[PDB]
Design a binder for these strands. Sequence first.
DNA 1: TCTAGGGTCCTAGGACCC
DNA 2: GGGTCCTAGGACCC
Length: 342
Amino acid sequence: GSRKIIHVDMDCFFAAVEMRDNPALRDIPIAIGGSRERRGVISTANYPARKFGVRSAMPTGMALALCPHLTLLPGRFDAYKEASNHIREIFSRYTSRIEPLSLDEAYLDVTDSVHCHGSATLIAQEIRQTIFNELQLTASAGVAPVKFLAKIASDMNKPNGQFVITPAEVPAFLQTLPLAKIPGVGKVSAAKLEAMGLRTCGDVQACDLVMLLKRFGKFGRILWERSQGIDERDVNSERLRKSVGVERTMAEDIHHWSECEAIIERLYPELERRLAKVKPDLLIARQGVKLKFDDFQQTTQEHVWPRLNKADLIATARKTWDERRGGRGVRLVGLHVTLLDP
DNA sequence: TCTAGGGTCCTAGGACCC
DNA sequence: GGGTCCTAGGACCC
Ligand SMILES: Nc1ccn([C@H]2C[C@H](O)[C@@H](COP(=O)(O)OP(=O)(O)OP(=O)(O)O)O2)c(=O)n1
Ligand SMILES: [Mg+2]
Protein backbone atom coordinates (compact mmCIF):
# COMPACT_ATOMS: atom_id res chain seq x y z
CA GLY A 1 0.00 0.00 0.00
CA SER A 2 3.01 2.27 -0.44
CA ARG A 3 3.05 5.23 -2.74
CA LYS A 4 6.02 5.94 -4.98
CA ILE A 5 7.22 9.58 -4.64
CA ILE A 6 10.02 11.19 -6.49
CA HIS A 7 11.44 14.56 -5.46
CA VAL A 8 13.36 16.10 -8.40
CA ASP A 9 15.88 18.80 -7.52
CA MET A 10 17.81 20.98 -9.99
CA ASP A 11 21.48 21.29 -9.16
CA CYS A 12 22.54 24.95 -8.29
CA PHE A 13 19.72 26.01 -10.45
CA PHE A 14 20.35 29.71 -11.18
CA ALA A 15 24.15 29.30 -11.33
CA ALA A 16 23.78 26.28 -13.56
CA VAL A 17 21.64 28.24 -16.03
CA GLU A 18 24.26 30.98 -16.00
CA MET A 19 27.10 28.45 -16.51
CA ARG A 20 25.22 26.86 -19.43
CA ASP A 21 24.64 30.23 -21.09
CA ASN A 22 28.21 31.44 -20.48
CA PRO A 23 30.92 28.71 -20.25
CA ALA A 24 33.65 31.14 -19.05
CA LEU A 25 31.85 31.01 -15.69
CA ARG A 26 32.16 27.20 -15.24
CA ASP A 27 35.43 26.83 -13.27
CA ILE A 28 35.21 30.04 -11.29
CA PRO A 29 33.29 30.96 -8.05
CA ILE A 30 29.96 32.66 -9.00
CA ALA A 31 26.77 33.51 -7.21
CA ILE A 32 23.40 34.94 -8.07
CA GLY A 33 22.44 37.53 -5.43
CA GLY A 34 22.25 41.30 -4.78
CA SER A 35 25.33 43.49 -4.32
CA ARG A 36 26.65 44.44 -0.89
CA GLU A 37 25.56 48.07 -1.54
CA ARG A 38 22.03 46.84 -2.27
CA ARG A 39 22.12 45.07 1.07
CA GLY A 40 21.67 41.80 -0.85
CA VAL A 41 21.94 38.11 -0.13
CA ILE A 42 23.06 35.10 -2.15
CA SER A 43 20.19 33.17 -3.87
CA THR A 44 22.51 30.44 -4.98
CA ALA A 45 26.14 29.65 -5.79
CA ASN A 46 27.99 27.11 -7.93
CA TYR A 47 30.37 24.45 -6.60
CA PRO A 48 33.60 26.50 -6.99
CA ALA A 49 31.92 29.12 -4.76
CA ARG A 50 30.51 26.59 -2.29
CA LYS A 51 34.01 25.36 -1.65
CA PHE A 52 34.75 28.72 0.05
CA GLY A 53 31.64 28.14 2.27
CA VAL A 54 29.39 30.46 0.24
CA ARG A 55 25.76 29.52 0.80
CA SER A 56 22.14 30.33 -0.19
CA ALA A 57 20.57 33.02 2.07
CA MET A 58 24.05 34.26 3.04
CA PRO A 59 24.43 38.07 3.21
CA THR A 60 26.46 39.03 0.14
CA GLY A 61 28.89 40.71 2.47
CA MET A 62 29.72 37.49 4.28
CA ALA A 63 30.09 35.83 0.87
CA LEU A 64 32.72 38.29 -0.41
CA ALA A 65 34.61 37.87 2.86
CA LEU A 66 34.67 34.08 2.46
CA CYS A 67 35.29 34.21 -1.29
CA PRO A 68 36.95 37.57 -2.38
CA HIS A 69 37.19 36.55 -6.01
CA LEU A 70 33.50 35.69 -6.23
CA THR A 71 31.66 36.88 -9.32
CA LEU A 72 28.19 38.16 -8.45
CA LEU A 73 25.30 37.88 -10.93
CA PRO A 74 22.04 39.85 -10.66
CA GLY A 75 20.03 36.98 -12.11
CA ARG A 76 17.71 36.56 -15.12
CA PHE A 77 14.19 35.53 -14.02
CA ASP A 78 12.91 34.98 -17.59
CA ALA A 79 15.67 32.49 -18.34
CA TYR A 80 15.13 30.59 -15.10
CA LYS A 81 11.34 30.64 -15.60
CA GLU A 82 11.49 29.37 -19.14
CA ALA A 83 13.78 26.50 -17.91
CA SER A 84 11.50 25.68 -14.99
CA ASN A 85 8.44 25.69 -17.29
CA HIS A 86 10.15 23.17 -19.60
CA ILE A 87 11.22 20.89 -16.70
CA ARG A 88 7.61 20.70 -15.48
CA GLU A 89 6.50 19.80 -19.06
CA ILE A 90 8.98 16.93 -18.98
CA PHE A 91 7.50 15.70 -15.68
CA SER A 92 4.11 15.83 -17.33
CA ARG A 93 5.20 13.29 -19.91
CA TYR A 94 5.52 10.77 -17.05
CA THR A 95 2.70 11.79 -14.70
CA SER A 96 -0.01 14.34 -14.01
CA ARG A 97 0.55 14.13 -10.25
CA ILE A 98 3.04 17.01 -10.08
CA GLU A 99 3.53 19.34 -7.10
CA PRO A 100 6.05 22.17 -7.91
CA LEU A 101 7.77 23.47 -4.73
CA SER A 102 9.68 26.33 -6.27
CA LEU A 103 11.16 27.02 -9.64
CA ASP A 104 13.75 24.21 -9.17
CA GLU A 105 11.96 21.46 -7.25
CA ALA A 106 8.91 19.27 -7.59
CA TYR A 107 7.31 16.24 -5.97
CA LEU A 108 5.97 13.55 -8.38
CA ASP A 109 3.51 10.79 -7.41
CA VAL A 110 4.28 7.90 -9.59
CA THR A 111 2.47 5.07 -7.72
CA ASP A 112 0.23 4.77 -10.71
CA SER A 113 2.35 4.68 -13.80
CA VAL A 114 3.02 2.40 -16.62
CA HIS A 115 6.09 4.35 -17.70
CA CYS A 116 9.01 2.10 -16.89
CA HIS A 117 7.31 -1.13 -15.90
CA GLY A 118 6.25 0.92 -12.89
CA SER A 119 9.87 1.35 -11.79
CA ALA A 120 10.27 4.66 -9.87
CA THR A 121 14.03 4.27 -10.02
CA LEU A 122 13.97 4.08 -13.79
CA ILE A 123 11.39 6.92 -14.17
CA ALA A 124 13.66 9.14 -11.98
CA GLN A 125 16.73 8.27 -14.05
CA GLU A 126 14.84 8.90 -17.23
CA ILE A 127 13.63 12.29 -16.12
CA ARG A 128 17.05 13.47 -15.00
CA GLN A 129 18.31 12.17 -18.30
CA THR A 130 16.26 14.11 -20.80
CA ILE A 131 16.33 17.11 -18.46
CA PHE A 132 20.06 16.99 -19.33
CA ASN A 133 19.38 16.32 -23.03
CA GLU A 134 16.96 19.20 -23.86
CA LEU A 135 18.14 21.75 -21.23
CA GLN A 136 21.82 20.86 -20.65
CA LEU A 137 21.15 21.12 -16.93
CA THR A 138 21.56 18.41 -14.33
CA ALA A 139 19.08 17.31 -11.70
CA SER A 140 19.33 15.09 -8.58
CA ALA A 141 16.46 12.94 -7.35
CA GLY A 142 15.09 11.08 -4.43
CA VAL A 143 12.65 8.13 -4.55
CA ALA A 144 10.74 7.12 -1.44
CA PRO A 145 7.40 5.80 -0.08
CA VAL A 146 6.59 9.29 1.29
CA LYS A 147 7.27 13.00 0.65
CA PHE A 148 9.79 14.08 3.26
CA LEU A 149 11.98 10.98 2.61
CA ALA A 150 11.99 11.56 -1.12
CA LYS A 151 13.10 15.11 -0.46
CA ILE A 152 15.86 14.05 1.93
CA ALA A 153 16.91 11.37 -0.58
CA SER A 154 17.39 13.84 -3.43
CA ASP A 155 20.22 15.33 -1.34
CA MET A 156 22.13 12.14 -0.79
CA ASN A 157 23.81 11.90 -4.18
CA LYS A 158 23.85 15.49 -5.36
CA PRO A 159 24.89 16.85 -7.73
CA ASN A 160 23.76 14.77 -10.70
CA GLY A 161 22.80 11.56 -8.92
CA GLN A 162 19.79 9.98 -7.27
CA PHE A 163 18.94 7.90 -4.23
CA VAL A 164 16.20 5.38 -3.44
CA ILE A 165 14.71 4.37 -0.10
CA THR A 166 12.51 1.29 -0.10
CA PRO A 167 9.96 0.59 2.64
CA ALA A 168 12.30 -2.12 3.92
CA GLU A 169 15.09 0.50 4.19
CA VAL A 170 13.09 3.16 6.17
CA PRO A 171 13.63 1.92 9.75
CA ALA A 172 17.47 1.68 9.30
CA PHE A 173 17.51 5.07 7.48
CA LEU A 174 15.53 6.83 10.22
CA GLN A 175 17.52 5.37 13.16
CA THR A 176 20.47 7.87 12.91
CA LEU A 177 18.76 10.44 10.75
CA PRO A 178 19.46 13.91 12.18
CA LEU A 179 16.19 15.74 12.96
CA ALA A 180 17.68 18.92 11.39
CA LYS A 181 17.46 17.08 8.08
CA ILE A 182 13.65 16.91 8.31
CA PRO A 183 12.13 19.68 6.08
CA GLY A 184 10.39 22.20 8.38
CA VAL A 185 13.00 21.58 11.07
CA GLY A 186 15.09 24.76 10.98
CA LYS A 187 17.72 26.14 13.28
CA VAL A 188 15.41 27.31 16.05
CA SER A 189 13.59 23.95 16.25
CA ALA A 190 16.83 21.88 16.01
CA ALA A 191 18.43 24.00 18.76
CA LYS A 192 15.41 23.48 20.95
CA LEU A 193 15.38 19.69 20.29
CA GLU A 194 19.11 19.50 21.00
CA ALA A 195 18.64 21.24 24.39
CA MET A 196 16.33 18.30 25.28
CA GLY A 197 18.89 15.68 24.08
CA LEU A 198 16.87 14.83 20.93
CA ARG A 199 19.22 14.84 17.92
CA THR A 200 17.93 11.95 15.71
CA CYS A 201 14.65 10.34 14.63
CA GLY A 202 15.97 7.48 16.82
CA ASP A 203 15.86 9.74 19.89
CA VAL A 204 12.30 10.88 19.06
CA GLN A 205 10.97 7.34 18.67
CA ALA A 206 11.88 6.78 22.36
CA CYS A 207 9.75 9.86 23.26
CA ASP A 208 6.23 10.13 24.54
CA LEU A 209 3.81 11.75 22.02
CA VAL A 210 1.75 13.72 24.61
CA MET A 211 4.96 15.40 25.84
CA LEU A 212 5.90 16.34 22.26
CA LEU A 213 2.42 17.67 21.66
CA LYS A 214 2.49 19.66 24.94
CA ARG A 215 5.95 21.09 24.34
CA PHE A 216 5.48 21.73 20.58
CA GLY A 217 1.82 21.50 19.48
CA LYS A 218 1.20 20.44 15.87
CA PHE A 219 4.97 20.24 15.04
CA GLY A 220 5.29 17.88 18.00
CA ARG A 221 2.85 15.57 16.30
CA ILE A 222 4.52 16.03 12.88
CA LEU A 223 7.90 15.35 14.35
CA TRP A 224 6.71 12.19 16.12
CA GLU A 225 5.23 10.98 12.80
CA ARG A 226 8.22 11.84 10.59
CA SER A 227 10.54 10.17 13.12
CA GLN A 228 8.71 7.00 12.34
CA GLY A 229 8.50 7.39 8.64
CA ILE A 230 4.95 8.59 8.75
CA ASP A 231 3.98 11.24 6.25
CA GLU A 232 0.50 11.04 4.67
CA ARG A 233 0.59 14.36 2.80
CA ASP A 234 -0.63 13.56 -0.69
CA VAL A 235 1.10 15.05 -3.74
CA ASN A 236 -1.16 17.97 -4.70
CA SER A 237 -0.95 19.40 -8.25
CA GLU A 238 -4.07 21.55 -7.69
CA ARG A 239 -2.21 24.09 -5.42
CA LEU A 240 -2.82 27.78 -5.94
CA ARG A 241 -1.33 30.88 -4.24
CA LYS A 242 -3.41 32.41 -1.45
CA SER A 243 -1.61 35.78 -1.36
CA VAL A 244 0.57 38.11 -3.49
CA GLY A 245 3.00 40.80 -2.44
CA VAL A 246 5.70 43.13 -3.63
CA GLU A 247 8.36 44.47 -1.26
CA ARG A 248 11.68 46.30 -1.64
CA THR A 249 14.68 46.80 0.58
CA MET A 250 16.24 50.28 0.10
CA ALA A 251 20.03 50.86 -0.10
CA GLU A 252 19.68 53.43 2.66
CA ASP A 253 17.06 53.58 5.51
CA ILE A 254 14.34 56.20 5.08
CA HIS A 255 13.25 58.64 7.78
CA HIS A 256 10.54 60.65 6.05
CA TRP A 257 6.92 59.78 5.47
CA SER A 258 7.16 61.25 1.92
CA GLU A 259 9.93 58.77 1.11
CA CYS A 260 7.63 55.92 2.20
CA GLU A 261 4.69 57.35 0.16
CA ALA A 262 6.94 57.63 -2.89
CA ILE A 263 8.15 54.00 -2.62
CA ILE A 264 4.53 52.87 -2.23
CA GLU A 265 3.58 54.79 -5.45
CA ARG A 266 6.34 52.74 -7.15
CA LEU A 267 5.35 49.31 -5.70
CA TYR A 268 1.66 49.68 -6.38
CA PRO A 269 1.52 49.30 -10.19
CA GLU A 270 3.59 46.11 -9.86
CA LEU A 271 1.23 44.72 -7.27
CA GLU A 272 -1.75 45.60 -9.60
CA ARG A 273 -0.03 43.94 -12.58
CA ARG A 274 0.67 40.72 -10.69
CA LEU A 275 -2.80 40.45 -9.14
CA ALA A 276 -4.42 41.18 -12.52
CA LYS A 277 -2.86 37.94 -13.87
CA VAL A 278 -4.61 35.73 -11.40
CA LYS A 279 -7.73 37.89 -10.87
CA PRO A 280 -8.60 40.52 -13.60
CA ASP A 281 -11.25 42.18 -11.40
CA LEU A 282 -8.72 42.81 -8.58
CA LEU A 283 -11.20 41.57 -6.01
CA ILE A 284 -9.63 40.21 -2.77
CA ALA A 285 -10.21 39.37 0.93
CA ARG A 286 -7.50 41.49 2.61
CA GLN A 287 -4.85 44.05 1.67
CA GLY A 288 -2.16 45.70 3.71
CA VAL A 289 1.35 46.90 4.02
CA LYS A 290 4.57 45.81 5.63
CA LEU A 291 7.50 47.81 7.10
CA LYS A 292 10.86 46.58 8.23
CA PHE A 293 12.98 48.73 10.52
CA ASP A 294 16.64 49.41 11.09
CA ASP A 295 16.86 46.87 13.91
CA PHE A 296 15.46 44.25 11.38
CA GLN A 297 12.14 44.04 13.13
CA GLN A 298 9.15 44.12 10.93
CA THR A 299 5.46 44.86 11.17
CA THR A 300 2.51 44.07 8.92
CA GLN A 301 -0.87 45.83 8.86
CA GLU A 302 -3.67 44.23 6.86
CA HIS A 303 -7.45 44.58 6.95
CA VAL A 304 -10.52 43.02 5.36
CA TRP A 305 -10.95 44.75 2.01
CA PRO A 306 -13.10 44.03 -1.10
CA ARG A 307 -10.79 45.23 -3.91
CA LEU A 308 -7.14 46.14 -4.46
CA ASN A 309 -7.04 49.88 -3.69
CA LYS A 310 -4.05 52.20 -3.68
CA ALA A 311 -5.34 55.13 -1.60
CA ASP A 312 -6.32 52.60 1.06
CA LEU A 313 -2.83 51.05 1.15
CA ILE A 314 -1.33 54.57 1.52
CA ALA A 315 -3.77 55.49 4.28
CA THR A 316 -2.90 52.18 6.03
CA ALA A 317 0.83 52.87 5.53
CA ARG A 318 0.49 56.31 7.14
CA LYS A 319 -1.07 54.70 10.23
CA THR A 320 1.58 52.04 10.40
CA TRP A 321 4.42 54.57 9.95
CA ASP A 322 2.92 57.02 12.55
CA GLU A 323 2.05 54.38 15.11
CA ARG A 324 4.61 51.51 14.92
CA ARG A 325 7.81 52.99 13.54
CA GLY A 326 8.69 54.54 16.98
CA GLY A 327 11.32 56.87 15.40
CA ARG A 328 13.35 54.13 13.70
CA GLY A 329 14.59 54.11 10.15
CA VAL A 330 12.76 51.89 7.65
CA ARG A 331 14.84 49.55 5.43
CA LEU A 332 11.94 47.89 3.63
CA VAL A 333 8.41 48.54 2.55
CA GLY A 334 5.89 46.11 1.08
CA LEU A 335 2.35 45.74 -0.20
CA HIS A 336 0.30 42.56 0.30
CA VAL A 337 -2.98 41.17 -0.81
CA THR A 338 -4.81 38.17 0.56
CA LEU A 339 -6.95 36.40 -2.05
CA LEU A 340 -10.51 35.10 -1.74
CA ASP A 341 -10.86 31.39 -0.94
CA PRO A 342 -11.71 29.10 -3.99
C1' DT B 1 28.82 39.22 7.65
C1' DC B 2 24.79 42.58 8.60
C1' DT B 3 21.21 40.08 6.95
C1' DA B 4 16.11 39.33 -0.49
C1' DG B 5 11.90 38.36 -2.20
C1' DG B 6 8.04 35.65 -2.46
C1' DG B 7 5.58 32.44 -0.42
C1' DT B 8 3.43 28.33 3.33
C1' DC B 9 1.85 27.06 7.66
C1' DC B 10 1.35 27.63 12.47
C1' DT B 11 0.03 30.01 17.09
C1' DA B 12 -1.91 33.48 19.72
C1' DG B 13 -4.73 37.51 21.77
C1' DG B 14 -8.96 39.14 21.59
C1' DA B 15 -13.12 40.90 19.00
C1' DC B 16 -17.17 39.26 17.00
C1' DC B 17 -21.50 36.46 16.73
C1' DC B 18 -24.65 32.76 17.86
C1' DG C 1 -19.08 29.78 26.35
C1' DG C 2 -17.45 28.30 22.49
C1' DG C 3 -16.93 28.84 17.62
C1' DT C 4 -15.22 31.89 14.11
C1' DC C 5 -13.01 35.66 12.38
C1' DC C 6 -9.47 39.04 12.36
C1' DT C 7 -5.09 40.35 13.08
C1' DA C 8 0.09 40.30 13.94
C1' DG C 9 4.15 37.80 14.26
C1' DG C 10 7.50 33.38 14.11
C1' DA C 11 9.59 29.69 11.77
C1' DC C 12 10.39 27.82 7.54
C1' DC C 13 10.88 26.78 2.58
C1' DC C 14 13.13 27.95 -2.17
N1 LIG D 1 17.32 31.04 -0.09
C1 LIG D 1 17.17 30.81 -1.40
C2 LIG D 1 17.48 29.55 -1.90
C3 LIG D 1 17.32 29.31 -3.26
N2 LIG D 1 16.85 30.27 -4.10
C4 LIG D 1 16.70 30.04 -5.55
C5 LIG D 1 18.10 29.95 -6.17
C6 LIG D 1 18.27 28.53 -6.69
O1 LIG D 1 18.97 28.42 -7.95
C7 LIG D 1 16.85 27.96 -6.68
C8 LIG D 1 16.89 26.59 -6.00
O2 LIG D 1 17.20 26.73 -4.60
P1 LIG D 1 17.89 25.60 -3.66
O3 LIG D 1 17.92 26.21 -2.25
O4 LIG D 1 17.22 24.24 -3.87
O5 LIG D 1 19.44 25.48 -4.14
P2 LIG D 1 20.06 25.23 -5.62
O6 LIG D 1 19.08 24.63 -6.64
O7 LIG D 1 20.62 26.58 -5.99
O8 LIG D 1 21.29 24.18 -5.27
P3 LIG D 1 21.28 22.58 -4.84
O9 LIG D 1 21.88 21.81 -6.01
O10 LIG D 1 22.13 22.54 -3.57
O11 LIG D 1 19.84 22.17 -4.58
O12 LIG D 1 16.00 28.84 -5.92
C9 LIG D 1 16.56 31.55 -3.56
O13 LIG D 1 16.14 32.44 -4.33
N3 LIG D 1 16.72 31.78 -2.23
MG1 LIG E 1 17.66 22.68 -5.72
